[PDB]
Ligand binder design. Sequence first.
Ligand SMILES: O[C@@H]1[C@H](O)[C@H](O)CO[C@H]1O
Length: 288
Amino acid sequence: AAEYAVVLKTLSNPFWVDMKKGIEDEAKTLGVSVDIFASPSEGDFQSQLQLFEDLSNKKYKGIAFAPLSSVNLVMPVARAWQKGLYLVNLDEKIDMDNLKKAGGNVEGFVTTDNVAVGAKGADFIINKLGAEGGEVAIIEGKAGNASGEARRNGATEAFKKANQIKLVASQPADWDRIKALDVATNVLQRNPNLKAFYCANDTMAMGVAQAVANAGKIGKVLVVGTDGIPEARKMVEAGQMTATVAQNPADIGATGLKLMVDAAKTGKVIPLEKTPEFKLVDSILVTK
Ligand SMILES: O[C@@H]1[C@H](O)[C@H](O)CO[C@H]1O
């Protein structure tokens, strides 16, 4: 039973696979042991809460977590903090009002400037479509995912401010490749003049690229993803996707572990209500 535990989401999303690897490799530099668990893609809020409670009961020094929802891990995170575990919030911000009410805190929150992500993707699309612009659509993450919402707002605002761009559709595909395919299929059907998709992540971007291929419209309709997973990078090189706004999940993981280990060294968990340490990891546009 390692010194530290991490709870990540489905390894069916290479984003979480790369964050896992990043964490293992940092652990090797720091010389600490980590146990890493991934929630099944179909696992419900309750089932992640039970895992965290169960990890909380073992002899872990700290737990880092990417929560299924802003609220689902409030009570178990508050109970781990109460026990004096060093807690780090990865990717998606836990509801800090509800965490306060529950008498808990976390040491730190490690994430990407996700407004900037969405803006970067939209700005790339606006610059690419040039003077004539045209109709664009957004394939959203799961409802209530703050990081997805940030990308949606960032992109939407960029599109709004460009007079030559009309956002014709904005619909969730819940981080799921197959749902993204089905949704993108229907959008194309309803908008024969569609020029581009922005997609809040790469599993959805890859579904959307398949929908564009199905309609025989590769190169004709732009597809911009987010995360920079290998298969999306491959698609970009091959010209099946236009671009992706790369995150660095390996760095989000490494930085989160380091924050948890550093916190532990002081021998004091962060006091309640005190704003956790905030660490931003860069994003970059990748194109062909
Ligand atoms: O930032 C992460 C990644 O974009 C993942 O692909 C979907 O969930 C988001 O919160």
